Each structure stands twice: as C-alpha cells, then as structure tokens.
Design an enzyme around this catalytic site. Sequence first.
Site, PDB file in Angstrom:
ATOM      1  N   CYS A 225      34.940 -54.979  25.488  1.00 52.52           N
ATOM      2  CA  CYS A 225      36.028 -54.058  25.202  1.00 52.52           C
ATOM      3  C   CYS A 225      36.353 -53.218  26.420  1.00 52.52           C
ATOM      4  O   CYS A 225      37.526 -52.992  26.730  1.00 52.52           O
ATOM      5  CB  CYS A 225      35.658 -53.171  24.012  1.00 52.52           C
ATOM      6  SG  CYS A 225      34.128 -52.292  24.257  1.00 52.52           S
TER       7      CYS A 225
ATOM      8  N   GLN B 255      38.662 -60.315  22.249  1.00 48.72           N
ATOM      9  CA  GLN B 255      37.495 -60.331  23.113  1.00 48.72           C
ATOM     10  C   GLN B 255      36.407 -61.257  22.592  1.00 48.72           C
ATOM     11  O   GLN B 255      35.518 -61.623  23.360  1.00 48.72           O
ATOM     12  CB  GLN B 255      36.943 -58.907  23.277  1.00 48.72           C
ATOM     13  CG  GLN B 255      36.446 -58.294  21.986  1.00 48.72           C
ATOM     14  CD  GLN B 255      35.910 -56.890  22.175  1.00 48.72           C
ATOM     15  OE1 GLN B 255      36.659 -55.916  22.124  1.00 48.72           O
ATOM     16  NE2 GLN B 255      34.606 -56.779  22.411  1.00 48.72           N
TER      17      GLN B 255
ATOM     18  N   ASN C 188      43.982 -52.668  20.141  1.00 48.88           N
ATOM     19  CA  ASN C 188      42.625 -53.165  20.075  1.00 48.88           C
ATOM     20  C   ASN C 188      42.563 -54.559  20.688  1.00 48.88           C
ATOM     21  O   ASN C 188      43.587 -55.199  20.950  1.00 48.88           O
ATOM     22  CB  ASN C 188      42.138 -53.186  18.634  1.00 48.88           C
ATOM     23  CG  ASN C 188      40.632 -53.112  18.533  1.00 48.88           C
ATOM     24  OD1 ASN C 188      39.948 -53.044  19.554  1.00 48.88           O
ATOM     25  ND2 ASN C 188      40.103 -53.137  17.307  1.00 48.88           N
TER      26      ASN C 188
ATOM     27  N   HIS D  93      33.337 -48.156  21.540  1.00 50.57           N
ATOM     28  CA  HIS D  93      34.318 -49.226  21.654  1.00 50.57           C
ATOM     29  C   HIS D  93      35.458 -48.711  22.498  1.00 50.57           C
ATOM     30  O   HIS D  93      36.047 -47.681  22.165  1.00 50.57           O
ATOM     31  CB  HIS D  93      34.818 -49.656  20.278  1.00 50.57           C
ATOM     32  CG  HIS D  93      35.749 -50.834  20.316  1.00 50.57           C
ATOM     33  ND1 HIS D  93      35.407 -52.028  20.915  1.00 50.57           N
ATOM     34  CD2 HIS D  93      36.990 -51.017  19.800  1.00 50.57           C
ATOM     35  CE1 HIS D  93      36.402 -52.892  20.782  1.00 50.57           C
ATOM     36  NE2 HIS D  93      37.372 -52.308  20.104  1.00 50.57           N
TER      37      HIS D  93
HETATM   38  C1  LIG Z   1      32.536 -52.289  23.418  1.00 53.49           C
HETATM   39  C2  LIG Z   1      32.903 -53.620  22.750  1.00 53.49           C
HETATM   40  O1  LIG Z   1      33.072 -54.622  23.442  1.00 53.49           O
HETATM   41  O2  LIG Z   1      33.003 -53.594  21.484  1.00 53.49           O
HETATM   42  C3  LIG Z   1      31.276 -52.439  24.262  1.00 53.49           C
HETATM   43  O3  LIG Z   1      30.184 -52.599  23.383  1.00 53.49           O
HETATM   44  C4  LIG Z   1      31.070 -51.360  25.353  1.00 53.49           C
HETATM   45  O4  LIG Z   1      31.454 -51.570  26.498  1.00 53.49           O
HETATM   46  N1  LIG Z   1      30.442 -50.221  25.003  1.00 53.49           N
HETATM   47  C5  LIG Z   1      30.151 -49.144  25.943  1.00 53.49           C
HETATM   48  C6  LIG Z   1      30.561 -47.773  25.448  1.00 53.49           C
HETATM   49  C7  LIG Z   1      32.047 -47.489  25.330  1.00 53.49           C
HETATM   50  C8  LIG Z   1      32.709 -47.660  26.695  1.00 53.49           C
HETATM   51  C9  LIG Z   1      32.208 -46.065  24.816  1.00 53.49           C
HETATM   52  C10 LIG Z   1      28.631 -49.069  26.049  1.00 53.49           C
HETATM   53  N2  LIG Z   1      28.104 -49.011  27.291  1.00 53.49           N
HETATM   54  O5  LIG Z   1      27.997 -49.050  25.001  1.00 53.49           O
END
Ligand SMILES: *[C@@H](C(=O)O)[C@H](O)C(=O)N[C@@H](CC(C)C)C(N)=O
Length: 212
Positions: free
Chosen positions: A25, A19, A175, A159
Amino acid sequence: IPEYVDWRQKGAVTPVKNQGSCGSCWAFSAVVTIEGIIKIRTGNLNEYSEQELLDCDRRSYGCNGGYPWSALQLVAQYGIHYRNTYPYEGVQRYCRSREKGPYAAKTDGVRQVQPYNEGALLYSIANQPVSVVLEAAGKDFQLYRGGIFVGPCGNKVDHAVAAVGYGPNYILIKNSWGTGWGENGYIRIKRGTGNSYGVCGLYTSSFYPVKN
Ligand SMILES: *[C@@H](C(=O)O)[C@H](O)C(=O)N[C@@H](CC(C)C)C(N)=O
C-alpha cells in the site's frame, strides 16, 4: 480552497489498482501522488511503477510494509519508471531500475502535512493528491461498499492510501484493493468530526511530493 475537490475529474488519477496479497500500500499510495503531480505540472497522465518502489526503497520492507515518505523520497532523489516498463508483480524482487533505462519522471522533494490538522490536509488535497494513512484492519472498513464512512475504526493506522479529493463532509480516498471494493475502488471518509486524529486516524501521517 473550494468546497469540492476531485482530481479524477481533472484527469489526474489513473485507474484503481489491486495491490493483491502484498503489503505494498505504501508504494501504491506514493505512486498515486506521483501520477497526480506529474499530471498537474506537465499535463500528462501516466502510470508509474509501484513495483519499482517495492523493489528499490531500501528503507521499506517490500511486501511486509513500508513508508510512503521514503518511497516519495526515492522518487525525488532518483526517479521512477513507467508502470509499463516496470509492471507490478505483487512480490518484492531486486531493484531493476538500471536495467530499465532512464527514469520516466522525477520529483524535487517530499513534504509532510502538519499532522492531526484537518484544514492542513484539505489545503494539501486542494493542491494535489496526498498520501495518507488510516486504520484499515477493522471489518467495517474492509467490508465498505459505499456511502460516507464514519467507522467504526480506531487510530491504529496500518494502511497507506491516497486522498484525491474531498467534500463538505468527506475526504475522497483512492484505495488499492481493486475496483470491486468500496465505490469503484474509492472511499469517502467522514471529515469535520473534531477528532484531531481524523476518522480511522486519517490525519496521522500525510505526505505529498514536490515537483517544481
Ligand atoms: C499497508 C498495506 O499494504 O496494506 C502496509 O502493510 C504498510 O506499508 N504498512 C506500514 C504502515 C503504514 C504506512 C501506516 C507499516 N510499516 O506497517
């Protein structure tokens, strides 16, 4: 359900992605589950566009994070393009679904796994890859290089990843940090500790797409 599930061995998992610096993520997570279920139903393994979800899921915050469930709802309502048609750029841009012609695939809905329930998650993974969240901020998770990961970690989930299998003592996670991280891009996280949160909060919030 069996004692081992590994969707990579059923050809339902595409190569590990990176990513990059973008907080996408949630979209990478959702795409894994779309890739898996379309393989499961149609027999075809394709790659779908994380970038499309990044650009087009208005309930999420692009590279600032987002929600696997809304990305999955977006694919159920509209659809998603091939990753080739709509490649990953690592930055949020405007939604270009219309300029890229007909969606390549569409799901019929999204379900939540009952939270804080390890059996419910394993049941779901036995059926298809599942979008799951965990706490990845801790250095132990970040420097993971292999083995069954037991932590240390809290439940401050941050994450989104994808569970594509499990064993007696672990859940197998794809991941999105590239093939250099972990076990060729995967992590086996300990299960069966009686912690209803799951290790690193793995049972907090899990979703999977439905494809009739
Ligand atoms: C995750 C990443 O890309 O490392 C993102 O930061 C993300 O989408 N975080 C999301 C919470 C998860 C889905 C639990 C958020 N809104 O913080």
